[PDB]
């Protein structure tokens, strides 16, 4: 007898606890392979993510460790939570893989982006990204890495945020390019950041939901900055005052743009606007977009003010907005350094307890 069985999914061997049957590959993004499965114990479908040798490098290890600790201690309906965690291997030396069991969602935002949402759904989705984000922030976690693939949705329009973003700290042998499209200027230009760095990302997603195309589709940070300033224009003088002379020199010496206006960037043809209701919602949609998509974060709308916005406020709920902050025991979580052997032991201790 063993508690586990093994089966192929694409070119991966899933070795899972017998309670999980009928594995369907629902995707293979960044962290590994993810399967849908039926869980005979709880009598429901779940998602199962396989981490292969998470401790193989310092990025995979810090992200995998961080993911485990946070997925345990945060309890909010807009952030995926762990149903179960396991490893098939019996001891620390044999130890290879970690399996994360999460509640199953129906899709991510990349798929929603290709649909035309009514205002009521779009406002709701966005309200839930806000509550998810506020919660993280109320516990010292700034994401800095929201994108459509890290945000999953249900058919009844419920939404959860998949991962916990970047830490406060690196090279990788991968075929997978990283997405920078949703990165805030203060991250791009490297000038330091605060809470509302995440609201640049939300504004990028929201703009994409409307226009059905990526707002700022650059191949590198240079090409990215170019696309930012074509659309929104060259930022004003007082923003430039905040850039280090090295980067400031570069920024200052780029071709200038007055930039497009929000009605021009986002015509009424893109929003439902047949009824008066829709007409009014559409102007409130642009109003908010014009406050999230501000380059100078001294002049960008904050999380709470966005929750306060008329387009959003429809759904406001204190139970959801001011849920008690998650308690994190690790406390050196964001900035800890270890070798790969030390990571293996930390991860293993986490999977085991």
From Swiss-Prot:
Complex and partners: Interacts with MAPKBP1. Interacts with MAPK8IP1/JIP-1 and MAPK8IP3/JIP-3/JSAP1. Interacts with SPAG9/MAPK8IP4/JIP4. Interacts with HDAC9. Interacts with ARRB2; the interaction enhances MAPK10 activation by MAP3K5. Interacts with SARM1. Interacts with JUND; interaction is inhibited in the presence of MEN1.
UniProt source species: Homo sapiens (Human)
GO CC annotations, alphabetized: cytoplasm; cytosol; mitochondrion; nucleoplasm; nucleus; plasma membrane
Record PTM text: Dually phosphorylated on Thr-174 and Tyr-176 by MAP2K4 and MAP2K7, which activates the enzyme. MAP2K7 shows a strong preference for Thr-174 while MAP2K4 phosphorylates Tyr-176 preferentially. Weakly autophosphorylated on threonine and tyrosine residues in vitro. Palmitoylation regulates subcellular location and axonal development.
Residues annotated with Phosphotyrosine modification: 176
Subcellular location: Cytoplasm; Membrane; Nucleus; Mitochondrion
Protein function: Serine/threonine-protein kinase involved in various processes such as neuronal proliferation, differentiation, migration and programmed cell death. Extracellular stimuli such as pro-inflammatory cytokines or physical stress stimulate the stress-activated protein kinase/c-Jun N-terminal kinase (SAP/JNK) signaling pathway. In this cascade, two dual specificity kinases MAP2K4/MKK4 and MAP2K7/MKK7 phosphorylate and activate MAPK10/JNK3.
Disease involvement: A chromosomal aberration involving MAPK10 has been found in a single patient with pharmacoresistant epileptic encephalopathy. Translocation t(Y;4)(q11.2;q21) which causes MAPK10 truncation.
Tissue occurrence: Specific to a subset of neurons in the nervous system. Present in the hippocampus and areas, cerebellum, striatum, brain stem, and weakly in the spinal cord. Very weak expression in testis and kidney.
Residues of the full protein shown: 45 to 400 of 464
Reactions catalysed: L-seryl-[protein] + ATP = O-phospho-L-seryl-[protein] + ADP + H(+); L-threonyl-[protein] + ATP = O-phospho-L-threonyl-[protein] + ADP + H(+)
This protein's record includes keyword Manganese: no
Motif TXY location, chain numbering: 174-176
Main location: cytoplasm
Source species, domain of life: Eukaryota
Active site (catalytic residues): 145 (proton acceptor)
UniProt membrane topology term: Lipid-anchor
One GO MF term: protein serine kinase activity
A biological process from GO: signal transduction
Required cofactor(s): Mg(2+)
Disulfide bonds: none
Keywords: ATP-binding, Biological rhythms, Chromosomal rearrangement, Cytoplasm, Epilepsy, Intellectual disability, Kinase, Lipoprotein, Membrane, Mitochondrion, Nucleotide-binding, Nucleus, Palmitate, Phosphoprotein, Serine/threonine-protein kinase, Transferase
Phosphothreonine carried by residues: 174
Record's protein name: Mitogen-activated protein kinase 10
Record family assignment: Belongs to the protein kinase superfamily. CMGC Ser/Thr protein kinase family. MAP kinase subfamily.
Domain notes: The TXY motif contains the threonine and tyrosine residues whose phosphorylation activates the MAP kinases.
Segments forming domain Protein kinase: 20-312
